[PDB]
Amino acid sequence: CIPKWNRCGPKMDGVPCCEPYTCTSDYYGNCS
Protein backbone atom coordinates (compact mmCIF):
# COMPACT_ATOMS: atom_id res chain seq x y z
CA CYS A 1 0.00 0.00 0.00
CA ILE A 2 0.69 3.78 0.02
CA PRO A 3 1.44 6.37 2.97
CA LYS A 4 -0.67 9.55 3.87
CA TRP A 5 -0.80 12.24 1.10
CA ASN A 6 1.15 10.07 -1.44
CA ARG A 7 0.21 9.28 -5.05
CA CYS A 8 -2.13 6.43 -6.19
CA GLY A 9 -3.50 4.95 -9.47
CA PRO A 10 -5.66 1.66 -9.13
CA LYS A 11 -6.86 1.20 -12.76
CA MET A 12 -3.06 0.92 -13.65
CA ASP A 13 -1.28 -0.29 -10.38
CA GLY A 14 -4.06 -1.95 -8.40
CA VAL A 15 -2.64 -0.86 -5.00
CA PRO A 16 -5.12 0.90 -2.53
CA CYS A 17 -3.84 3.13 0.30
CA CYS A 18 -2.59 1.93 3.72
CA GLU A 19 -5.40 1.09 6.32
CA PRO A 20 -7.04 3.27 7.77
CA TYR A 21 -6.39 5.19 4.42
CA THR A 22 -7.86 4.93 0.91
CA CYS A 23 -6.81 6.01 -2.59
CA THR A 24 -8.82 9.06 -3.87
CA SER A 25 -7.60 8.08 -7.45
CA ASP A 26 -8.52 6.10 -10.64
CA TYR A 27 -5.27 6.71 -12.65
CA TYR A 28 -3.63 9.85 -11.06
CA GLY A 29 -4.75 10.90 -7.54
CA ASN A 30 -3.53 10.46 -3.93
CA CYS A 31 -4.07 8.58 -0.59
CA SER A 32 -6.34 10.14 2.06
Question: Overview of this structure, please?
Answer:
- It is classed as plant protein.
- The entry lists the keywords cysteine knot, plant protein.
- This protein has about 30 residues and is mostly beta strands.
- The protein has strands at about 5-10, 30.
- It has a two-stranded antiparallel ribbon with strand order 1-2.
Q: Helix and strand succession?
A: EE
- Measured distance between first and last alpha carbons: 12 Å
Assembly classification: monomer
Instruction: Report the sheet with the most strands, covering strand number, pairing sense and barrel closure.
Output: 2 strands, antiparallel
How many strand segments?
Answer: 2
Coarse shape: globular
Number of domains: 1
Instruction: Please state roughly what percent of the residues sit in beta strands, choosing from under 5%, 5-15%, 15-25%, 25-35%, 35-45% or over 45%.
Output: 5-15%
Structural class: mainly beta
Q: What is the percent of helical residues? A: under 10%
Identify the strand order in the major beta sheet.
Answer: 1-2
**Radius of gyration from the alpha-carbon trace, in angstroms:** 8 Å
Total number of helices: 0
PDB class: plant protein
Keywords: cysteine knot, plant protein
Assembly: monomeric
Entry title: solution structure of the main alpha-amylase inhibitor from amaranth seeds
